[PDB]
Curated annotation (Swiss-Prot), chain A:
It comes from the Viruses. The gene is S. Glycans are attached at N40. This is Spike protein S1. Binds to host ACE2. RBD also interacts with the N-linked glycan on 'Asn-90' of ACE2. Cleavage of S generates a polybasic C-terminal sequence on S1 that binds to host Neuropilin-1 (NRP1) and Neuropilin-2 (NRP2) receptors. Interacts with host integrin alpha-5/beta-1 (ITGA5:ITGB1) and with ACE2 in complex with integrin alpha-5/beta-1 (ITGA5:ITGB1). May interact via cytoplasmic c-terminus with M protein. May interact (via N-terminus) with host bilirubin and biliverdin, thereby preventing antibody binding to the SARS-CoV-2 spike NTD via an allosteric mechanism. It comes from Severe acute respiratory syndrome coronavirus 2 (2019-nCoV). Attaches the virion to the cell membrane by interacting with host receptor, initiating the infection. The major receptor is host ACE2. When S2/S2' has been cleaved, binding to the receptor triggers direct fusion at the cell membrane. When S2/S2' has not been cleaved, binding to the receptor results in internalization of the virus by endocytosis using host TFRC and GRM2 and leading to fusion of the virion membrane with the host endosomal membrane. Alternatively, may use NRP1/NRP2 and integrin as entry receptors.
Curated annotation (Swiss-Prot), chain B:
It comes from the Viruses. It comes from Severe acute respiratory syndrome coronavirus 2 (2019-nCoV). This is Spike protein S2'. Subunit of the fusion protein that is processed upon entry into the host cell. Mediates fusion of the virion and cellular membranes by functioning as a class I viral fusion protein. Contains a viral fusion peptide that is unmasked after S2 cleavage. This cleavage can occur at the cell membrane by host TMPRSS2 or during endocytosis by host CSTL. In either case, this triggers an extensive and irreversible conformational change that leads to fusion of the viral envelope with the cellular cytoplasmic membrane, releasing viral genomic RNA into the host cell cytoplasm. Residues 6-49 are annotated as: Heptad repeat 1.
Amino acid sequence: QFGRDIADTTDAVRDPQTLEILDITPCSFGGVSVITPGTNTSNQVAVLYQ
Amino acid sequence: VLYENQKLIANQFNSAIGKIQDSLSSTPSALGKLQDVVNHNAQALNTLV
């Protein structure tokens, strides 16, 4: 009915309606860091997605 | 004792370079530290998984 990997997580599932096989991949995730200079100089910032 | 047998010591150095290039990957246990530090973190991360 389904399958796992070395991570012991369900990364492959089979829908019981049809005979196809559907992969399982998580959507976008990760931390965020803000690039900025010293606050005494300027307030301009940059956004970095990890 | 270098300018008098420069050709001999040059040939010896080239032979040493060739034999260390041949024996760098002669055994799988030569690069033990890099493989160990790869495994000790990869297996720990996977065990945390």
